[PDB]
Paper text:
SDRs each have a Rossmann fold for NAD(P)+ binding, and the SDR active site is characterized by a conserved catalytic tyrosine residue, which is accompanied by a lysine residue to give the conserved motif YxxxK; frequently a serine or threonine unit serves as an additional active‐site residue to make a catalytic triad. To investigate whether C. roseus harbours an SDR that uses strictosidine aglycone as a substrate, SDR gene candidates that were co‐regulated with known MIA biosynthetic genes were selected for screening in in vitro biochemical assays. The discovery of VAS demonstrates the capacity of an SDR to reduce an additional isomer of strictosidine aglycone to form a new alkaloid backbone. The reduction catalysed by VAS probably works by a standard SDR mechanism, with the C‐4 hydride of NADPH attacking C‐17 of the iminium substrate.
Crystallization of VAS was carried out with and without the oxidized cofactor NADP+. After solution of the structures it was clear that the apo enzyme active site also had a high occupancy of NADP+, thus indicating that VAS is purified from E. coli as a holoenzyme. The two subunits of VAS in the asymmetric unit form a dimeric assembly. Part of the interface involves an extended loop from each subunit (residues 103–124), delineated by β5 and β6 that form a β‐hairpin, although sections of this loop are disordered in both subunits; this is referred to as the “flap domain” in related structures. The core of each subunit is the canonical Rossmann nucleotide binding fold characteristic of the SDR enzymes, in which the cofactor lies across the end of the central, predominantly parallel, β‐sheet. The two active‐site cavities face each other across the apparent dimer interface, with the two opposing NADP+ C‐4 atoms only ≈17 Å apart, and are framed by the base of the flap domain and another loop that arises between β8 and α9 (residues 251–266) and folds over the cofactor (i.e., the “cofactor loop”). In this arrangement, the active centres are effectively inaccessible to bulk solvent, thus prompting us to speculate that the quaternary structure suggested by the crystal structure is not representative of the active state of the enzyme. In support of this proposal, the elution profiles of VAS in size exclusion chromatography and dynamic light scattering analysis are consistent with a monomeric species with an estimated molecular size of 32 kDa (calculated molecular mass of His6‐VAS is 34 469 Da). The substrate‐binding pocket itself is comparatively constricted, with the C‐4 atom of the nicotinamide ring projecting into it.
Numbering used by the authors: 7 to 103, 115 to 299
Amino acid sequence: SEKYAVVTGSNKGIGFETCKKLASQGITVVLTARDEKRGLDALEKLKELGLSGKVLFHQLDVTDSSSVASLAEFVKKQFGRLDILVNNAGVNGVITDDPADVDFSKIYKETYELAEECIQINYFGTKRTTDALLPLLQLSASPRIVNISSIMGQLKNIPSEWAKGILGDASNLTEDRLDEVINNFLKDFKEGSLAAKGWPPSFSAYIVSKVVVNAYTRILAKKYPNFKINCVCPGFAKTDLNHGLGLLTAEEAAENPVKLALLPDDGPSGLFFDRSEESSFE
Ligand SMILES: NC(=O)c1ccc[n+]([C@@H]2O[C@H](COP(=O)([O-])OP(=O)(O)OC[C@H]3O[C@@H](n4cnc5c(N)ncnc54)[C@H](OP(=O)(O)O)[C@@H]3O)[C@@H](O)[C@H]2O)c1
C-alpha cells in the first residue's frame, strides 16, 4: 500500500519541490542532501506542511561511495524496497566571476576542474546512486527512475559527428561507450580544443553531462522493461542553478518529474520529456 521514494539533491530547488509534491500524494519520501544542516532545515519546512506522506531525511553525496552505500542500507532497513528514484542532484559546471553596452560574456567562468566535477555529479553520481538502489527498486511492484536532464541534453547541442554517432546509436549504446565520449570531451577540454573537436564552447560540461544522462536513461530502460525509466527537462526554473533567473518557479518545474514518477502502470519508458510533452533525443 505505502510507496517509497528517494530524491537526490533535495534540500532546495526542483528537488525540494519534487519531495513536496510526492509527499502531498501520500508517498513516503526520503529527502536527501549532501549537507546535513541544509537537509534537516528542508525537512523541517516539509514537516510544517502537514502532508499525507511521511518525510524522512538521509544524507547523500552522489560522488561519495560510502555516502551512497549508507543511503542504500538505510532504505533497505527502513523500507525493504524502493518504488521511485529521482536523480535530481546536479550542477552547471560554471562559476560566476549605457545599459545596452553591458557585456556579460565573461561572467561565467569554466575550468577543467569544474568540468570534471560537473560530469562526476551529474552523470557518474546518477549512475552510482542508481546502481546502489537498483536491487531495492527491483522489489517494487512498479519501479520508476526519473533522471532530471535539460533541453540542452538534445544531441543537436553537440556538433561532433563522432560524438553524435555514438550517442545517437541507441541499439549499440553501452556504459563503456558513454565513458569514451566523456573521456574524449575532457581530454579535448584540457587541451583547449573544444571548438576544433566539435564540443559546445559554453556550458560545455553541463551539456555533455545531460546528453550522456539522456543516453544512460535509454540504456537502463532497455535493461529493465518492468521499470518506467524516463528523463525530463523540467523547464527553465528560478533556482540557484541560474542565480535566480528563470521562467518557471521551482514548484511549477517540479510538476514535470513528478508526473513521470506517478505514471500509470502501463505508462511509457525510455523516453525524453520536454516538461509535460514527449520530445526527441535528437
Ligand atoms: N533550474 C533550471 O532551469 C533547470 C533546467 C533544466 C534542468 N535542471 C536540472 O534540475 C536539477 C535540479 O537543479 P535546480 O535547478 O533545482 O538547482 P539547485 O537549486 O542548484 O539545486 C541543486 C541540488 O543538487 C544538489 N547537489 C549538488 N551537488 C550534489 C552532490 N554531489 N550530491 C548530492 N546533491 C548535490 C544541491 O545541493 P547543495 O545545496 O549542497 O549545493 C541542491 O540540493 C539539476 O539536475 C539541473 O541540471 C534545472
